TrEMBL record, chain A:
Ranges where the Influenza RNA polymerase PB2 sixth domain occurs: 402-551
Record function comment: Plays an essential role in transcription initiation and cap-stealing mechanism, in which cellular capped pre-mRNAs are used to generate primers for viral transcription. Recognizes and binds the 7-methylguanosine-containing cap of the target pre-RNA which is subsequently cleaved after 10-13 nucleotides by the viral protein PA. Plays a role in the initiation of the viral genome replication and modulates the activity of the ribonucleoprotein (RNP) complex.
Position of sequence motif Nuclear localization signal: 607-610
The protein, known as: Polymerase basic protein 2
Keyword presence, Amino-acid biosynthesis: no
GO MF annotations, alphabetized: RNA binding; RNA-directed RNA polymerase activity
Top-level taxon in the UniProt lineage: Viruses
GO biological process: 7-methylguanosine mRNA capping; cap snatching; DNA-templated transcription; symbiont-mediated suppression of host gene expression; symbiont-mediated suppression of host mRNA transcription via inhibition of RNA polymerase II activity; viral RNA genome replication
GO CC terms of this entry: host cell mitochondrion; host cell nucleus; virion component
SUPFAM superfamilies membership: PB2 C-terminal domain-like (SSF160453)
Keyword Ribosomal protein: no
Organism, as annotated: Influenza A virus
Record's keyword terms, sorted: Cap snatching, Eukaryotic host gene expression shutoff by virus, Eukaryotic host transcription shutoff by virus, Host gene expression shutoff by virus, Host nucleus, Host-virus interaction, Inhibition of host RNA polymerase II by virus, mRNA capping, mRNA processing, Viral transcription, Virion
UniProtKB/TrEMBL annotation, chain B:
Name of the molecule in the record: Polymerase acidic protein
Binding site for Mn(2+) 1: 41, 99, 110-111
Keyword terms of this UniProt record: Cap snatching, Endonuclease, Eukaryotic host gene expression shutoff by virus, Eukaryotic host transcription shutoff by virus, Host cytoplasm, Host gene expression shutoff by virus, Host nucleus, Host-virus interaction, Hydrolase, Inhibition of host RNA polymerase II by virus, Manganese, Metal-binding, Nuclease, Phosphoprotein
Cofactor: binding details: Binds 2 manganese ions per subunit.
Taxonomic source organism: Influenza A virus (A/Zhejiang/DTID-ZJU01/2013(H7N9))
Binding site for Mg(2+) 1: 41, 99, 111
UniProtKB/TrEMBL annotation, chain C:
Protein name, as recorded: RNA-directed RNA polymerase catalytic subunit
Pfam family, one: Flu_PB1
Record gene name: PB1
Catalytic activities: RNA(n) + a ribonucleoside 5'-triphosphate = RNA(n+1) + diphosphate
Binding site residues for Mg(2+) 3: 412, 457
Family recorded in the similarity comment: Belongs to the influenza viruses polymerase PB1 family.
Lineage top rank: taxon: Viruses
Amino acid sequence: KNPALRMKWMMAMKYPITADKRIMEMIPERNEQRQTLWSKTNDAGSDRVMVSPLAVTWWNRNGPTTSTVHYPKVYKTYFEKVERLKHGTFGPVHFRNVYIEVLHLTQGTCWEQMYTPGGEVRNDDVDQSLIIAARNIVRRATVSADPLASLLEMCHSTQIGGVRMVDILRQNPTEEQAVDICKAAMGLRISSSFSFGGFTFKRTSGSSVKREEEVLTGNLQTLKIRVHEGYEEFTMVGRRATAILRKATRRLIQLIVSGKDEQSIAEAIIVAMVFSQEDCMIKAVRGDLNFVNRANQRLNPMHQLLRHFQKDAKVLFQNWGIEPIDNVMGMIGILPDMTPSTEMSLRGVRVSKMGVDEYSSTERVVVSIDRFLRVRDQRGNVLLSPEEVSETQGTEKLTITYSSSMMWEINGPESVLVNTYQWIIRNWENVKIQWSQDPTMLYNKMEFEPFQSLVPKAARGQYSGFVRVLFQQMRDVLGTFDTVQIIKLLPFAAAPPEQSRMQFSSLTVNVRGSGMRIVVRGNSPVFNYNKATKRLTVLGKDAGALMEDPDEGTAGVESAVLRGFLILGKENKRYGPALSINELSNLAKGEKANVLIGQGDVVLVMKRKRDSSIL
Amino acid sequence: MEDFVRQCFNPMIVELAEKAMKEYGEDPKIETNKFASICTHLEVCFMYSDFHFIDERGESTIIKHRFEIIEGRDRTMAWTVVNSICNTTGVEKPKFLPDLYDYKENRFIEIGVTRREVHIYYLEKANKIKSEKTHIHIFSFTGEEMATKADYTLDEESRARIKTRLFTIRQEMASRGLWDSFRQSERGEETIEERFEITGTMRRLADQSLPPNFSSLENFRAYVDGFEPNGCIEGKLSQMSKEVNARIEPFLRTTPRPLRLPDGPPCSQRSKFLLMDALKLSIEDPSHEGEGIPLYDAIKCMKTFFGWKEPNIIKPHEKGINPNYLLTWKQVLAELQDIKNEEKIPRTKNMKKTSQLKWALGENMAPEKVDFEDCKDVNDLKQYDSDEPEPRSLACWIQSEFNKACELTDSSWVELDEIGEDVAPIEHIASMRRNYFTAEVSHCRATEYIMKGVYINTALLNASCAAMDDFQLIPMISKCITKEGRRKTNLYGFIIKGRSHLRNDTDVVNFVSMEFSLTDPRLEPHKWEKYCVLEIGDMLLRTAVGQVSRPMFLYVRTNGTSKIKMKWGMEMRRCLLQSLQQIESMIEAESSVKEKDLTKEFFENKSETWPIGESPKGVEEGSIGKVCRTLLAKSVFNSLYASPQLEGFSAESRKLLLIVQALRDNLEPGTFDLEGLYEAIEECLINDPWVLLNASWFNSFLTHALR
Amino acid sequence: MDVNPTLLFLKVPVQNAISTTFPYTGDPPYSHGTGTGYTMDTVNRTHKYSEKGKWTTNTETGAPQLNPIDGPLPEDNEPSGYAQTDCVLEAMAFLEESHPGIFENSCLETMEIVQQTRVDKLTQGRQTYDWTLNRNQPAATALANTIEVFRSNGLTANESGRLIDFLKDVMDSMDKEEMEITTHKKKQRLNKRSYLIRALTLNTMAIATPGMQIRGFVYFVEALARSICEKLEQSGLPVGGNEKKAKLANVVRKMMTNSQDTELSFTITGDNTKWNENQNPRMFLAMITYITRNQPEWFRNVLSIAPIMFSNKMARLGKGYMFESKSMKLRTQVPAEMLANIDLKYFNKSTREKIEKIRPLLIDGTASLSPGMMMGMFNMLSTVLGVSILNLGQKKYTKTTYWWDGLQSSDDFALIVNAPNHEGIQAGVDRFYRTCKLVGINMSKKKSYINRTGTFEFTSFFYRYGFVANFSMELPSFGVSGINESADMSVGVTVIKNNMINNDLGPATAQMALQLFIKDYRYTYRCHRGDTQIQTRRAFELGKLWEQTRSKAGLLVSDGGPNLYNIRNLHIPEVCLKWELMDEDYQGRLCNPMNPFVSEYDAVATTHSWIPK
């Protein structure tokens, strides 16, 4: 309490700072504006003079510079924190309830949020960038109108680190679920092994045939499955869990899995159980399974069962049964409570130390692509799909750009604004023609969907109505075109407008919580236009360049600033003194005034005699 | 010296050492050698318990950690871990806190490092601690190592590594030229016999501090030392009175009754400013010369009105000075005109001392100071009137006050700065919740009240602490942003503070506040008892039959505020945080049962109905928006009406709510003393209107839920 | 149609919306509960609950004393301060039996800290009574004055710097017949009785603050009590938030799941309001002597000095009273030193009755209060007693079909009782009530309720079907601490982070706290973002910086740059958070060691860190 008020009041005076006397003979006696940067008074009880924080800012902005040495080496503690945070990743958050400085994120009131910090380890820049880009593209395309064509458009309309991603895809042998799905959609060759349950399944012995079986679940729900009959030998490959599995006709006989931690081993074991197509787990199904992705589209029953088991499997472990175990070198058991045991283990699931690892394969196959990106090989088994794509997201060692129409809402609201205006400026000719001819379709363009999110819901229909009326006036008046205004104001009209009487002098866009304001007339921090250089700046980030179209009024009048009114340029003292925007509601048709639009400039305006209508 | 330890030792070990010494309350700056000693001890313990694991068969494998650290944690965690280990393995409970625990050997090991010879340290440690089945690991910087029974759990490689670490550390101290101090600081902690004798006064006091039937402390010590329980509790309970018992009253649905409300004259407004009846003289967009200064803004806002009349009193202050309020209002207007006549107007203008100003403030009505010796012989000299205020009946105007406080305004009252981007999904959920709530409540009247109070209180405090002996004038300004997006500046009235020579935080400054309004105070005069009402103009308002003229009233009232109350009113922004916390807690409570982030369907769904009111046809629901606005309004009302009565009633009624809840879930509840709880709750319903309305809400909820 | 927030509970279970019922969530502005009449009523009630206790006259302070221990057993449900020594000792013995060695380990692990603490440890703490000046004073200045006076009086052993040495110095000074106080030159001679009464004072602006001669002994006894509690499971101290949340769930799981389906379980939540009336320092001394059985005598004396001294505690009486005459419009104030002999016509009926009750105790303007305790000095010992009472509820001790357990933290208590039938539950609750009454533990029947197991609360940790709703903390100040730009930023961001970690602060609420933080910081230091249109003198040069920098995000918030903090990134220092983004020239200028401005919290030694004039 006391310190805050004391500092607030102390900073008020002109010279609240105390500094050594040397500053007298090192910095100018005042500023370029003649402001004094010090005072001759000496601190009580010492020889230090009194100066002002303006001197602090002067030193910060144009003070003498020195070499930055001993700083990176001395601060060895917080730098590692920065590296771990930035190079770390994240994951799905579950509402149920290295790791010594992230406590708030990992644990909360009643939810858990996974996080794996970084450091300087792991794979290279190109592979990680490709994996993350493919993950984002696939995840967004999951919810598109048609994932296949949309995904192709995103892949062909994006690049990685200044290099088109198609070249990397064709010249990079990196393997990943998202990358493999993108390659399959592109029609190239993908790995024979099929990514299921988050791990790569590679067959290396045995075979089976597909049969359609109807099975009654433990919850009294009948599901149709494509059960495989015949001995098969699979290897589950994963970074933190590698396993070797045998399967037979509706029977699991052996599974040896090695993982760094118990969680990965448990995940691999659950994946093996679900892949085994055992009747016992069918009888162990509880509840109604309707798992869907962000697109709410129903998935195949196997994926739903896998998700249900991943949610929890405590009620299933004890149902398998009890069998004996033999003590062997490099052999570990699996208790029902998920704990290794020397004397006992869970049925048909063992744990080894080294496991099956090391050598990989370089085999590729020709595959076909179905409606919703579900990659299926010639045999019939599902190879890949977005349902099996991991949720991990990290950082990009090199800049990655996404010019598509649905990747904009990734870099942030500022990025959304900048990219919407970039799209508007890049398509200036076509957008102008559409606005002139059939603007109704333009106002329904999906490319403006992100902007509708930034504009508050409570004040988006009224904003849209104001914009529609203003643009109708601009169209029906003629002779007063102004491209900058059109680009600035177009995106706000997307909503289904409604009639209103407000005369908006500024519209609000929510960026990073704080709401910025863009003025209908003149320049705004959100939208700046420099006519001296003819450049548009959006929040300090360039958005493109504007070229004046074959319509313009270079002699005053501007009809798209005040609804129902036409501004006639410079003010005239002869007419009625400066009015108020609210008062303008009483002027008669054709009346003129000297309204004060804003800032410190007066503009003469005449009330439109006609009336511009909208749908 | 500590710089070397900080730079060499890894951050985690130094952080653990800092926490450990903070637990014992020892400052590292004063004690330097012990800092290095503790850091080395922790380092050697961790190395002893590093890169060691136990395989699933039982054999020792080097890559379930073989060694578990017990001294690397705090006392509570270490004690819990050792208790659990002993209970599970049935091992003899250690006397002290061991440094490490070996799982393969299932035994507790202690680590010791000394500057002097190892043998003396081992001997003293064994004599002090070792009594049965205990092992100590002893090392030193001299390169000589030994342990108990010549048994080392660590292999040759680990022992050599620890020896090399100690040797390189010793070489570092030798190079730095401070190893001599390190060695000399060690002395073995000579444990000379400690004597603490109670004698003289303390012996008498101790002898006079024993239970009955005891003559001296020594007799009691001997008695307790030889004490062994034998059925004393059972005997006392058998001989205890049967009437003593905590009986459970069967709590059914019919038992509860509504709280008995007090009877008497209706309540009255006591807020620092009007809430439902405030009036604003506003400028849509301040672009005039000299912006930012509250005085110029107030002058400009005043110039927008031309309906001034000759002031006259409609509803007078019954127990107060009516004419002087009028005189001081006239003085305010004349002083403003005089300021208008000036050219070089300073930042603020102090009103000249006048009779009416002093009388309205209360300076001339303030009792003087004199010692009790010179005023004892006074016929009516009594203790301050610490008498319980008279009961006041519930009045409907507070209900309307809250109703209008919960309505939706048409301006952006609160402006908040920016933060970083959100990358984690939990960050996305948090941003979504915050943005939804903010969009909901940013247009509520509660935010208007918050900003008005903050501005008034900050200006008043700055004026009070700026000029001590000046009766300054302070406009009541509030800056907002309309829906259209124009910076509106509203002026509600004026305040004049008294003398502000403040030395204590609780010192009371007296001010006189004049507030505009358009409510006729002859409709509910009882609501207005502390105010003097003047009619200082007429306003033209547009209605379906043109511009009708209605009177413009002014409420003048003398109030007092303390610096701590000023800060409390300057920190009302926390009402938004509290209201969020409430809605977020409800979100989490409803989500946990369903086990999924439910904010998306909580806010956007617009299919939920939370009972938030009542109507003639029955109860009424609303939206999550209505819920958020109601909670924020309740928080602001609680902040403005801060009184012990409110907290008392809330605390005593929360228990009744909980018991009713338990009744709803068929938990078969019971009450030991229901009437006592009822009396405790009703003790807080005497005169306050806010608490009375809360009690009325509680009675409505009681009569509705049990149906 | 008319707002009614309470009606929310008509569909939402109350436990979910409990925050609705916390009106303040802060420090109110009135400070109701401190004065003189409150002390009068406290003393009167303390001596009333010991009505039948034996009366005696003290020999050193020359004041009466009341001893209710072993008095007649209560016959009515009203509060009783008749705590039996034998029952307390039996309860402690049973606690030791169920937890063997606990007292032994506590003693042997605390002897070192008893022999290790330095004198400066007493500097940390709350306000202290300065016998030299006879008024509440900061601990540090009180210590300085005490050492100065003792040095003047030839008691300089405390110069060794050991806390035990200073305690011995205090013992010697108290043994002296009289001492001198030199204030600045005014000399005051305090006799043996005067000094003794001063040293046993309890000032009242932890409502009560003892003097300085009793700080170290209180600290030692509280350290032992904390050490004993640590080994105790039912004890609610000194754990934090997560462990406290887990305690309720663990207790419920233990009591319910293990129980048979036939058995019925119930839970009672109770508040031990006015918890210090019925607990006497003599019973605490008895339990302390029992704890240190077969231990070195010096340690026993050091540990037993505290309750011995407190049993003769003297309570000060507020600042006084204020009288006013409306007829003559006059105001006057009278001190408490003149309250012993003064007319009772000035006061009202209740106040004059209280004065009549407390008249025969005021010694030298300071009442004598042997029985009862004062808030917030021996809380851990009270928790120890409560956990002993709880431990006396096992199936082996009860020797009955029913049984019980629960938690106690000395301010709230919860008890789960289960039995084969409803009559069994009634018998269990009644037996617990009587047993806790015998020891002097008082359960308020007007603020306690019983319901089927699953839903209850403890220390505001409301529990419903495995869900805890911790509401035991208030929101701190998110403002400028007033040191410097980097210092304030670092301390405040660390504050919000720490509150998030433990105090159970929601993420969105943390985000708004950071928002208000940025607002207040920019307003106070006048360092606004370059893009913003706000105007001030500092905005001029600041503006220049905004133009010069090639990376806006690199600039520090104090320098006008954007605030990139968020939930994910809060622990990192602000300077380190923008290290790479900062332009090379800006980095060199900012952290120049040769700057003229420079001759806990985690921050970098930038030029923004200066000492205010």
